Design a protein around this ligand. Structure first.
Ligand SMILES: *C[C@@](*)(O)[C@H](Cc1ccccc1)NC(=O)[C@@H]1CCCN1C(=O)[C@H](C)NC(=O)[C@H](C)NC(=O)CCC(=O)O
Ligand SMILES: [Cu+2]
Ligand SMILES: [Cu+2]
Length: 224
């Protein structure tokens, strides 16, 4: 997260992290006791999912193994359209005051809405710096028309932009799959942006969750 601040402790119990052993790879959100929703480009052959703490490496944190991942059938490794994926938890996820289900959206929030994006991604760019504490930053949803003026052909269907005008406030490497929340509901998953991160007027791009609600449910309904 660029130009953000440490999230208030316990304000993100549905936030999870995908680790390659001990190193952060991506972020994600807990859908239920066995499902994590993250970015499709965050795919791994095996994951070590962090849950229950704002600090990576917390001794109290939960670390569950994952070997099954289900990317949206329409994901493109060339355009990154449909950048979302569900990862099945090998073991049950023990809920608590620090681990809760995320609230999926029932509709698409409109442009101009102020939202919060969070992650343990790099806080600097081009040079990389990874924080142990979960970082948060507020951004505003940008209309598809406005964003197309910036990215043109790079924008495909269900790609939601968010950012602050003339501001470095944005997501970056390691933040993918992480939640973009507005009004208590999940509106987006960090997908992509420009490099280096935090270029003013260069919006962060998110997978627009309100467009995949049916897919998310059916996929969890079919695989256990
Ligand atoms: C996977 C996730 O952690 C990461 C998060 C992120 C978000 C914003 C900025 C940087 C990183 N997302 C990515 O790494 C995604 C998926 C791989 C490609 N990617 C990018 O964000 C890259 C840096 N962006 C691009 O390639 C975009 C589409 N174009 C440009 O940067 C312009 C280059 C050109 O014109 O060819
Ligand atoms: Cu990695
Ligand atoms: Cu690419």
């Amino acid at each position: 997260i660029i130009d953000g601040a440490p999230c208030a402790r316990g304000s993100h119990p549905w936030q999870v992290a995908l680790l390659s052993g001990n190193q952060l790879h991506c972020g994600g959100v807990l859908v239920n006791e066995r499902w994590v929703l993250t970015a499709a480009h965050c795919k791994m052959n095996e994951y070590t999912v962090h849950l229950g703490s704002d600090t990576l490496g917390d001794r109290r944190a939960q670390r569950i193994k994952a070997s099954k991942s289900f990317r949206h059938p329409g994901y493109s490794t060339q355009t990154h359209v449909n950048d979302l994926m569900l990862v099945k938890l090998n073991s049950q996820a023990r809920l608590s005051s620090m681990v809760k289900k995320v609230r999926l959206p029932s509709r698409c929030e409109p442009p101009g809405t102020t939202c919060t994006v969070s992650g343990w991604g790099t806080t600097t760019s081009p040079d990389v710096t990874f924080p142990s504490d979960l970082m948060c930053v507020d951004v505003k949803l940008i209309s598809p028309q406005d964003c197309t003026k910036v990215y043109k052909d790079l924008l495909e269907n269900s790609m939601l932009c968010a950012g602050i005008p003339d501001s470095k406030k944005n997501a970056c490497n390691g933040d993918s799959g992480g939640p973009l929340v507005c009004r208590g509901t999940l509106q987006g998953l960090v997908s992509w942006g420009t490099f280096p991160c935090g270029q003013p007027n260069d919006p962060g791009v998110y997978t627009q969750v309100c467009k995949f609600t049916k897919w998310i449910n059916d996929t969890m309904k079919k695989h256990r």
